[PDB]
């Protein structure tokens, strides 16, 4: 995350770090004690031995001895993810569930029919680079960015028609604050009180962008509302699966 700030324990309790052979590669969001929602592109051919992945939760410092690390039982990625950029979404089933504590909590999904509010300012978090030619963050970072309309984002001066309908952009025309390499798969959350209580919901999944924090090249996210049914199905369908599977 470029242009963000260090955050503290318990603030974004759904954030997890997905590590392969010891390195942090992607972010992810807990949907329950044993299911994580992330991006499909975090599982290229060279990173598909489930035994080599670990999910780290409950700490904001990557080197905290107090976080919990569990294995992966299965990964279900979207079959429509043609690179295997639309449908850049996947579900990760942990081998055992995490306890839910004041530091580990799931995030909510958008309600049926709930649409993105253009202009609304949401939060994006992660341990990715704080500069494109920089290093990953030691402590989880958070930044607030507004949702941009697809009309603006698909214009010739932004991403000239590369934003498909199940993805959206968030950022400032001016650049300066954005997600970056190492943040892929993590959360883009917006808070609302439609259930009469303020709750944070996962509206987007960090997916891609050209460079990081450049003006007119905002970050692009997978629009979670469009995959609600895919998620509900996948979990039912594969609760007892092991391996890389597609839905």
């Amino acid at each position: 995350i470029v242009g963000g700030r260090d955050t503290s324990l318990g603030r974004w309790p759904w954030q997890v770090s997905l590590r392969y052979d010891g390195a942090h590669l992607c972010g992810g969001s807990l949907l329950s004690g044993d299911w994580v929602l992330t991006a499909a592109h975090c599982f290229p051919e060279r990173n598909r031995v489930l035994s080599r992945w670990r999910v780290f939760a409950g700490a904001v410092a990557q080197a905290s001895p107090h976080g919990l690390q569990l294995g992966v039982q299965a990964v279900v990625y979207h079959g429509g993810y043609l690179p295997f950029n639309s449908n850049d979404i996947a579900l990760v089933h942990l081998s055992s569930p995490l306890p839910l504590t004041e530091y580990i909590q799931p995030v909510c999904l958008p309600a049926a029919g709930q649409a993105l509010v253009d202009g609304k300012i949401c939060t994006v978090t992660g341990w990715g680079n704080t500069q494109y030619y920089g290093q990953q963050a030691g402590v989880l970072q958070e930044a607030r960015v507004p949702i941009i309309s697809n009309d603006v984002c698909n214009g010739a001066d932004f991403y000239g028609n590369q934003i498909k309908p199940k993805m959206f952009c968030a950022g400032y025309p001016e650049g300066g604050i954005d997600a970056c390499q190492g943040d892929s798969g993590g959360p883009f959350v917006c808070e609302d009180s439609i259930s009469r209580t303020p709750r944070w919901r996962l509206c987007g999944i960090v997916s891609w962008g050209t460079g990081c924090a450049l003006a007119q090249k905002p970050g692009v996210y997978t629009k979670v509302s469009d995959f609600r049914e895919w998620i509900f199905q996948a979990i039912k369908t594969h609760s007892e699966a092991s391996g890389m599977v597609t839905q």
Partner: protein
């Protein structure tokens, strides 16, 4: 901007908005309670219903609802949205559904 489907934090009873009245109605208990509880939690953005039970208006009260809605159990399994298989009804047994959905989106620090 309330969502048409709500769950009570006092006793988890489900409430569904009735736009012709501007009131919330309870969901009459039926043999398909498990699927209705599951579908209601999904609808609202929760992952699943952890459990559900049946309440009795005579022991629990109405809690500010006006009537009942009943689910067309035959159409139930063809839906994605609760509101399209529901109708006002009398619910003679005066027993309604309560659903405990998986909690989410809230910090638990002091």
């Amino acid at each position: 901007p309330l969502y048409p489907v709500q769950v009570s934090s006092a006793d988890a009873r489900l409430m569904v908005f009735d736009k012709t009245e501007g009131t919330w109605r309870l969901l009459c208990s039926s043999r398909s309670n498990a699927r209705v509880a599951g579908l209601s939690c999904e609808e609202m953005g929760f992952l699943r219903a952890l459990t559900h039970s049946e309440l009795d208006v005579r022991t629990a009260g109405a809690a500010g609802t006006s009537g009942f809605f009943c689910v067309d159990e035959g159409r139930l399994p063809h839906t994605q949205r609760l509101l399209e298989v529901i109708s006002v009804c009398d619910c003679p047994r005066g027993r309604f559904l309560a659903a405990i959905c998986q909690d989410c989106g809230r910090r638990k620090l002091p």
